[PDB]
Structures are given as C-alpha cells and as structure tokens.
Amino acid sequence: QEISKTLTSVYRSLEEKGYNPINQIIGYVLSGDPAYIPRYNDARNQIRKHERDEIIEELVRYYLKGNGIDL
Amino acid sequence: TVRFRKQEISKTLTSVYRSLEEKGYNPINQIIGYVLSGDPAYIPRYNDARNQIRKHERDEIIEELVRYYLKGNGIDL
C-alpha cells in the first residue's frame, strides 16, 4: 500500500499549493521529472522513494483489476 | 455492442492483456514497456493487440491510468 499512500500524500500537497494535482502527477509519470512535484510537505521526496516503472506497474495493475482482469 | 460494467482505453488495455496472456508473455511487463516507451513493438500483433494500442497516444493512456487510480482510491473525490 506504499504507492497509494505516496500518491495520496502527493495529491494533497499539490492541492494545498494550488496546483492541479492530476495534471502535475500526469506530468511526472510522462516525464520522470521530479520538478513536476513540489518540494512542499516532502511531496517530491515521497515520490522519489519509488521508481517510475513501479508507479506505472501499480497504476496498470489497479486499472486492469478494476476493469475486469483477474491478476 | 456494449460492455456490461475512456471505455475504448478500457477495451484496449484489457484486450491487450488477455492477448498477451494467451500467447504466454508477461502482460504487465509488456504493457509497462509500452507505457514507458510509447513503442507499439512491446505489444504483439496477435489478436489485434498492437492495432488496438495504436489507437491511443502514450499520454492519453497515462492520463486515463492516473485519473482512474486517483478517483478509484478516493483521492480525487
């Protein structure tokens, strides 16, 4: 559950800083550029615990399970 | 034809997974490779899987994956 906790915390810190949190997270996943995630409230340091391919693996597994795949 | 439960991405990614599974490949690994690279060559032609992935851009796939995850986990809610 680490990745869901990270993305939750990052979304809420993005929101508090007045960013569009979805756009910034999409930007991070596209680019791997930590600059899309503010340093505020440790958000950038939290997302850097994971590798982008681990984040993508979780997004993909979650999406497929929710759309009817038995993993 | 309706799917009983964006919907095109749902159709594409589930169909790609099942075709990769039928051909004995690691489907998650191949899908991750596509998402990181945008390269349709990570997807076999088999059962129209590559044709379906090529209906989308990598950023549209990533946008849907991110939006679906946040909404489903109650973060964007």
Residue numbers in the entry:
A (entry chain A): 18 to 88
B (entry chain B): 7 to 11, 17 to 88
Give the exact sentences the study uses for this entry.
Here, we identify a protein (CcpS) that is phosphorylated by Stk1 and modulates the activity of phosphatase CpsB in Streptococcus suis, thus linking Stk1 to CPS synthesis. The crystal structure of CcpS shows an intrinsically disordered region at its N-terminus, including two threonine residues that are phosphorylated by Stk1. The activity of phosphatase CpsB is inhibited when bound to non-phosphorylated CcpS. Thus, CcpS modulates the activity of phosphatase CpsB thereby altering CpsD phosphorylation, which in turn modulates the expression of the Wzx-Wzy pathway and thus CPS production.
To gain insights into the architecture and mechanism of CcpS modulates the activity of CpsB, we first solved its structure to 1.6 Å resolution. CcpS also formed a homodimer, each monomer containing four α-helices. Helices were connected by a short loop and a single turn of 310 helix between helices α2 and α3. However, we could not observe the electron density map owing to the highly increased flexibility at the N-terminus of CcpS. Interestingly, two phosphorylation residues Thr4 and Thr7 are included in intrinsically disordered regions (IDRs) of CcpS. Interface residues analysis of CcpS homo-dimer suggested that many amino acids residues were involved in the formation of a dimer. And the amino acids region I73-L81 among helices α4 was contributed to the hydrophobic core, which was similar to the previously reported structures of CcpS homologs. We found that double mutations I73RY80E directly blocked the self-interaction of CcpS. Importantly, we found that the disruption of CcpS homo-dimer structure directly resulted in its dysfunction in regulating the activity of CpsB and thus CPS production. Superimposition of CcpS onto CcpS-T4ET7E folded structure revealed that overall structure was highly similar to each other; however, we can observe that a resolvable structure of N-terminal partial region is significantly different between CcpS and its variant CcpS-T4ET7E (chain A, N-ter).
